[PDB]
Write a protein that binds this ligand. Sequence first.
Ligand SMILES: [Co+3]
Ligand SMILES: [Co+3]
Ligand SMILES: [Co+3]
Ligand SMILES: [Co+3]
Lengths: 156, 152, 152, 151, 217, 217, 216, 216, 120, 119, 119, 120
Amino acid sequence: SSSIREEVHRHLGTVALMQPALHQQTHAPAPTEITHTLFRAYTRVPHDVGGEADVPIEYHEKEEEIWELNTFATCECLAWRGVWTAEERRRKQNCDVGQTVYLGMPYYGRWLLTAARILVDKQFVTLTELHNKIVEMRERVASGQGLGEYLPPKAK
Amino acid sequence: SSIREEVHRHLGTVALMQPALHQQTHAPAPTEITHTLFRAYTRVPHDVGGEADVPIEYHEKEEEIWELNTFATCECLAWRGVWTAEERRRKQNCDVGQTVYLGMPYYGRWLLTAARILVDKQFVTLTELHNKIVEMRERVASGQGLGEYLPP
Amino acid sequence: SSIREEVHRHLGTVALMQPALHQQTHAPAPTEITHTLFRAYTRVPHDVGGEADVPIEYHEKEEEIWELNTFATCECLAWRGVWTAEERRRKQNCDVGQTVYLGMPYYGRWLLTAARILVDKQFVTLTELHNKIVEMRERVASGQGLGEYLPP
Amino acid sequence: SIREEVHRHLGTVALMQPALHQQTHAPAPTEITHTLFRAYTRVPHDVGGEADVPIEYHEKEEEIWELNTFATCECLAWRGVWTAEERRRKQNCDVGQTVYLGMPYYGRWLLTAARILVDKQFVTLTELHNKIVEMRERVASGQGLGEYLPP
Amino acid sequence: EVSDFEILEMAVRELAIEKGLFSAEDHRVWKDYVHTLGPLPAARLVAKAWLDPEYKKLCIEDGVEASKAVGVNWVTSPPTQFGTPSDYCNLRVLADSPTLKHVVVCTLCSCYPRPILGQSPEWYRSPNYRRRLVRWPRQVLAEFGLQLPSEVQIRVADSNQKTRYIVMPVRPEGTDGWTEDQLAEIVTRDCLIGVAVPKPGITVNAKRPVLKANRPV
Amino acid sequence: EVSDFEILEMAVRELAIEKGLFSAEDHRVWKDYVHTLGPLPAARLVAKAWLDPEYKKLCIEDGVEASKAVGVNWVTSPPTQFGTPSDYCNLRVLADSPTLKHVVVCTLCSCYPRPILGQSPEWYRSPNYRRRLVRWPRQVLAEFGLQLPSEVQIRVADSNQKTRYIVMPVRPEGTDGWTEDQLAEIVTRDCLIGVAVPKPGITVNAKRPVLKANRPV
Amino acid sequence: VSDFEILEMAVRELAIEKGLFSAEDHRVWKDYVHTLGPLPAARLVAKAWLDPEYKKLCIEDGVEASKAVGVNWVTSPPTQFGTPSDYCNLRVLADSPTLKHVVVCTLCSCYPRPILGQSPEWYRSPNYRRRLVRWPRQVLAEFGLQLPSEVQIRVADSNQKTRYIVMPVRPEGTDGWTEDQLAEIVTRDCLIGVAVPKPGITVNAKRPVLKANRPV
Amino acid sequence: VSDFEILEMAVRELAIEKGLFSAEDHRVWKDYVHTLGPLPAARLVAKAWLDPEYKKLCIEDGVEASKAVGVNWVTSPPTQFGTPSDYCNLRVLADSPTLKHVVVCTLCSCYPRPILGQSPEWYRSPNYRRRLVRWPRQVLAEFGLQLPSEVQIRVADSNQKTRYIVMPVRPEGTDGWTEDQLAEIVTRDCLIGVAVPKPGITVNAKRPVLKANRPV
Amino acid sequence: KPVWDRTHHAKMATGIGDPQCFKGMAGKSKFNVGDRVRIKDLPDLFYTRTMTYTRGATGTIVRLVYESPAAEDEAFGNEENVEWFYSIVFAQKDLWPEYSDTFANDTLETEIPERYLEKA
Amino acid sequence: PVWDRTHHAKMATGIGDPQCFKGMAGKSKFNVGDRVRIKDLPDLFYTRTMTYTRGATGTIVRLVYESPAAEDEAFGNEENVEWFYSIVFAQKDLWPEYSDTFANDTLETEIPERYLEKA
Amino acid sequence: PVWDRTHHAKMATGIGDPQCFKGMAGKSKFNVGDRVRIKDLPDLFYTRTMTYTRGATGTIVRLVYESPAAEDEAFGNEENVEWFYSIVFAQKDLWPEYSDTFANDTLETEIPERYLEKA
Amino acid sequence: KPVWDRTHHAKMATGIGDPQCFKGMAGKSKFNVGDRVRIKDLPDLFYTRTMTYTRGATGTIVRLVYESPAAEDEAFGNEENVEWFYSIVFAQKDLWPEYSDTFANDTLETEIPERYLEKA
Ligand SMILES: [Co+3]
Ligand SMILES: [Co+3]
Ligand SMILES: [Co+3]
Ligand SMILES: [Co+3]
């Protein structure tokens, strides 16, 4: 049955979490513990994944979030108007974010974070102005005022 | 060549750094066990068909003398009635548990299990097995050799 | 404080992201097992004294009805000669293997092991156990009730 | 000795600590909770209060290159290339979670010193890459390498 | 039910406009430009090439010039008047043949010929596709349901610099006398990426799971 | 809904009874016995020892014999008539002094003096407590709010074989002329384990988080 | 000496000391194993290609067919009741222009030892056991084997007492070939199903070989 | 040579080549650091112990008090505006019969270098930085230090521009001691707060020492 | 102290074979070649040789291979009950959701004891 | 783009850091003895106000100096200067598990005015 | 295969465990006060002599009782009974990092005679 | 103090395009179509668009695609230097040791700037 098959596939995915491994936590090891092989691995450019072994996955399509479309437009508009070139974006977005964020966060999440980043790094906005804007935005949502096309204001 | 070798070592090394949400488990309360986890934990370790895995360049492996001897020992124990092959499979490929099942070598499990049946069916006491292991080590240390593995 | 709750939830969550060199093990060859690894893999799971661990805010836990029933069952089985407590400990705290030992709950292991001794000493066939589990599930689904866990 | 093997064992079994290891491969936005968003966007250097185990603290002999790296970083600040705060932000945060705990303390200081030269365009990335090649060839040709290796 | 991403998106956009980095009109203009993008122009270029050997030659040698024929000028079609900042202006058309079949990827990211093909598929952006295609193309293609003779040259194109590609598949049998519209109809987005080949009767990408957005466009 | 554990518990119990391994009566009898267990007898043993030097000597040399004075016969109180199968019959009382303070643990599991003290605490069974106490007792006890002079000998007792322990802490100041009942009242379960010391006015274990059960007894 | 060799000696000496099996029994088994190989299975295939009546027998009753190449699944092994682990129920899977088989034991390493010899290291791998049943086309391509999309690829999972050998279709360019000539191109890999017989190819495809610490 | 040494050379040469700083600047800085040590701080404590007026000054204005021991936070460093990383706001934390301090920089390794020298390897570890602020009693016990439960243990987290040195209480058995005698038992560890001064102990507690690959 | 019979198996199978020595002990088979059967998801605690990937899937019986005690019983020393084993063919599309229609004819064949089968 | 490499040295030489910012913050918003709660301001990209302090209340024991917030200084923005306060927190207000046995233990750290609000 | 389910009860009823094994170990090999080192005997499958004690030396403070070793009892082998000893170890002898400040701390645990050898 | 020129790129590429706006700025090309080149393993610290999987491999130049600043420089705002970019075809067998001889004609085509090339 569909329910049984559903549990079977959920099981096959779940056991992957239990795959045995020799898990060595790294807590700022001394230089003497860093081999050349490790040095190259750590200083690698995160976006360079071609050739790495990976498993087969059932590829899927994903609907576009309104915020993703707006993020894409913002990034191209910033480049259009000279805040940066696309290559500068790629370097900051797909490499500077570091290994953990590179694979732990969503594709467009990195685009957005990096758009905020270029505003601060090139001093078009102070980090204070960004932090302050986020706080104000959150208040906007919490109050019921609504948030543009993401949330309508409070009615009756 | 030397460059390609470093390239391939790199492709294999970066896999160790693959980010993940690593949740250590330290005897969680029953309320932390979902039916999904219950089934996954009580699964039979040898049932891996259908699990996602990566492509690997398959290799042949030269047989170790001890592996040939272990295989013979297991079939001889079955031949002589100490167990049937199914009892061996159950003990060897399932009872060993998830960690040993994939962390130790194929024949290492065959061997551990051969020692296990001797103790579980009381043909030898665990004490006899422990003493025997000590004897083998002393035989090597004393220079008396160890079967066909080491001459005296 | 909702803020403090978020702060502590944060401190616990970042631990999941602790960087590490994660080496998956898929039945490595004997040549990849050092003596250190051999001793670690063949260790008895319950022997944890001296291992490093972090400070945790120790808590009390209410007893589940099934936990009380499991304890009684295990002691009754020993009382009536099915096994001695030492046999139970060996099967329960060691034979279950590393993964189940720390992945499942304390009493979960006690219960699984009580089921295990019934099968290993052949007082029940594995088939009878499997059939009984099926019967229990249907009993619950039918609205027939389940002991003092679920009234009909 | 027996005790040595006992301690090596206690340390080794830690590698086998069971866990639910969920690899993350660019999850969709719907898989990111606020809790995870905060954990991922955290500044790496803010570790106060995180649970950790007891370790027998040790002193560490100073490497010549560490001594030189520290001096280079303070000299760059002394001469206005950056302020210490700019260094901290780039060195202990911008590097990201993985490098932050996977590499050595001074390794991050050094990588970041190289980073500031490139980010403020005092040197092009090409000049840095070329210089690295230069240092390697200097060693390979036996011309020596500073005070680390005599010709 | 606003997410941290939606809060941040709003924050970034408002700040950029307040600081005059780009205008509200600019943002609307880009969004509207993107909404006009899709795989139709690329599909038409392939159909036209199939129906005109002379045009096909142009496509293979000068993708940029050929693109103009389907209304997509890589330099002037985008709002910038200098091509999109991220897709650049160097489109190359890869022509399959009885002995050659192409498939495209960007291992470094998600580089895609947006001006003429639209937005990239979610799976095209995946670390998985980017890791495997260049090394195990035969296997990945098989998963997509595509298999070619062993002697045929499968060529994987990795769009790592400023060039963007579209694949011109071999014209399938059973299309004798077909019009431009009929042919363009079977050249789907997947065919232009290279994970599928055109087939009479098939006018939409192969069905596959669709992950829903929390707040879709 | 019933959990996988409750389903299996019923299955195991019914099968065991069905096969005559133990009777339904045996199970009820054991649950009743467990229900009568608690820390009160152990607390009275300590109070009695504080008030009777002769008895204290007995406690220290022969815990089993001393236990009879508080109504707990390790051999005959349990339903077996040969002691509980898991707690055995060799209780030892550890006497603290101005130069010695004990704390107990079972690194291999959760061995506890059930007949005289009741059921073990959830934290006592934790891998965490079992890993750390034997190696960092000073730090663990501090976490519990207990600290002793650096010169005092802290002794960790690891109940790894058939012996079970209870700690007889030193009588606290401020209990002059107190009756046995008054003294026993401040000897909590935690004091008998060794993670706390008796204090006038404190008659319950230190409050700590309580994890609720899905379906409590 | 490794911990494995120490344990092997211990287990063997204890088993013999306790009379579970003798030193002679152990030598008898190793000698039997040394007589095993892929040749008998290859001969069965060659014979089937040259005799339609025999081919029909192979497909319907593998155990009976095996006797023709001198391997009686019941009486050839020292036990006289089949090997304890391989049992006595061999089935031969016949490929055809519309069907191609490949074998695996997802639960372990079940293999037709009596007629084929010992299993390859990779056949025992968790990797092969996880992937083949689900992505056979992909795994076979990795091995260098590809079949038409319309051809039925059938993966046989040897999970119970049946053991299988694959009878590949006879390849082109073997007209007039003798039984020996035909048997020579039916390699172990062809009998597992990860390869197909080819004129001129008489050995398994070259693959990496991991060396043992102390080989037989 | 290591990847670190190669990069250090590359960075240093490039910086000098571009005129960011000179070889002389680098040499001058290494020399300045080389002269740094805990002696100045130890003397400040000893002085405070023998001069009520000075003790008050130490507690109220650490920067001013530091001058009395030859370390001027503004002018002693080569910059003439304090070291770029240690700044110029030293605060002295005075222990008492009811208060004992211990210092850490959870965000990094902020240390009062000008008056104390370079930080200990363990002081910079993620472990120390994670634990001290939450479990100070336990961490200090590991270091061998324990204080009465009623005594206020105060952890100072050096997260901004202030740097600290701890002024421990004067120990018993030092009556009539000279400033030098008193300063001799005020080790680096006492100034961090992980140890207290004790007559007869003139060096930090011995602990493992990880050796460098190429020291000097 | 328990005594194990180490001669039973040899005395029973010598000159006959395994599973040949169980022939006829299962009685009449519940299913026949050609029948469509669904795999019951029976509990798998401790042991099973009916792969998880087959649970709930429907296949076609192509052969009654032999009679034998179920592995679930044999693996624990219980051989008193013998049942029929069937070779079942599954369409790959029915096991793996992502299997391509391009390879519409691919299948998987494996053996399952009668206890796991129910008419489709 | 040109970076001013002489600015810092010019303003701090012979004066020191943070002495060179003295008087630039104006009147302090809080005074010694005031009870303040730490606002959980966004931590994106950078912050030197540890997460473990967010939402906790402490006592100001000293106005240490004036300086640009680290959040600005670390990105080359020194145009704004504010007061920094040394704050003392009771350990029990930071860590839920802290023992009452050690009821007087505290933690002292510095936080710029922007994170403070009257308790 | 039949399992004797009355043996233990018939033997220990009215007596207790380990009281029921009294006298079966014969003469003890060691006495109170003796210094003994813990032998690192093979641990395969089961042991109740913790790894952290292997190779360490302690002082016997009591002969607690007689009983079959857990290594045998846990597998249904009770034919052999031996003496169990309560041993006290100095913490510094177990943990390299133990502080000299707490030099009097100890650990007491029980070990069967088979693991002991004169120090 | 730093002022970023936000009009440079637009003024330079408007009506022309990117990389068209860099045409002729690289001078004479060092290599030509048909040349066999090996990819130099240049340091990749901080950034590179020449995939690690190509390092040390040898391929055939099939086209001089355009001129442009190397991404290694462009990504950091340095566009003063322009060089030739080449499309190179590699035999799959030369990149992946395990590639099957059955698919001996398979290739991989990608672009690489002149700085990474050297005559093979
Ligand atoms: Co891309
Ligand atoms: Co216990
Ligand atoms: Co198998
Ligand atoms: Co710091």
